[PDB]
Amino acid sequence: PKAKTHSGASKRFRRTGTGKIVRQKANRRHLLEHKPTKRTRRLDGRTTVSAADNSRINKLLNG
Amino acid sequence: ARVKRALNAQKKRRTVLKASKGYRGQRSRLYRKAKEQQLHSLTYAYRDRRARKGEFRKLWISRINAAARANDITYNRLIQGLKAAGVEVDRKNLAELAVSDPAAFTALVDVARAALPEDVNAPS
């Protein structure tokens, strides 16, 4: 039997050229009238995932 | 490749049982109960081998102090004299001299008396 890649993790994370794992930030979907532009500006773009959960994420994406 | 565990297992049963001969009751017949004894038996030995050195050193002191008081000198002073006099016979042979050939022990005591200070309670 093959190993089924996790559907949710496959739709949220990415692999870059070197093998990094990136992710998007939260708190940017709704209820953002009162969030100043500084908060929203720092909340966009892909960020390398923390090394705390880098072990679990590799297991999900690769298997 | 089914393996019958008779040959491999019977080996350790013979060792404990043969080594537990002379025990009283169940501790001499059944492997389960004999093994429980061999755990204690080999723990007692390792503790008694260390304690034997202290025990035998003791018996010698009792023989030394008994003969030392027969020559009118307390044991603690007799040792203080001997250390000061430069005699370095241990306790095993000192107890041996005291029992077997008392003539030498009297000679040793007289050496200890001489090397003792004049007033042993002096703050020197």
């Binding site: 996790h6 949710g8 993790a9 739709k11 949220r12 994370f13 998007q24 930030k25 939260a26 999900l60 | -």
Partner: protein
């Protein structure tokens, strides 16, 4: 003369399996699992975090789509062209795959990375901006299919 009894594995090849739960001398009575609990009896799933919303469910999904009709090219750098063809000559797609520069059935595009010093008449499905210059300035022709 070697026989079947002279054949030995290379040192470090074969390593003895660690039997587990086979006596308290090695790995006894718990087999490395510790005492009671969930992980003592069976296992715990990878995507499970004790109830808290998992890292794969409290992060927004990645943006966009895939565009099924995406045309993905196979790229060979002009630097590789120089190395594989010191003399020069014509180099079509078949000539590239003969030197193992691109996959056999792919859509080749030539990219201008290295330095080209040879007279070469390439033929690829597309060319980057610098690939045109590197081919032409070195006295070559780049005709695309």
């Amino acid at each position: 003369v070697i026989k079947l009894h002279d054949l030995k594995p290379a040192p470090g090849e074969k390593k003895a399996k660690t039997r587990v739960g086979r006596g308290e001398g090695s790995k006894g009575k718990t087999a490395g699992r510790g005492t009671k609990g969930t992980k003592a009896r069976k296992n715990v799933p990878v995507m499970f975090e004790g109830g808290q919303m998992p890292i794969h469910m409290r992060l927004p999904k990645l943006k966009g789509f895939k565009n099924r009709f995406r045309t993905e090219y196979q790229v060979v750098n002009v630097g590789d062209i120089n190395k594989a063809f010191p003399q020069g000559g014509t180099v079509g797609v078949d000539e590239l795959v003969a030197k193992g520069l691109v996959r056999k059935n792919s859509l080749v595009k030539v990219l201008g990375d290295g330095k080209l010093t040879v007279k070469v008449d390439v033929t690829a499905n597309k060319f980057s901006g610098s690939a045109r210059e590197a081919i032409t300035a070195a006295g070559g022709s780049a005709t695309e299919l």
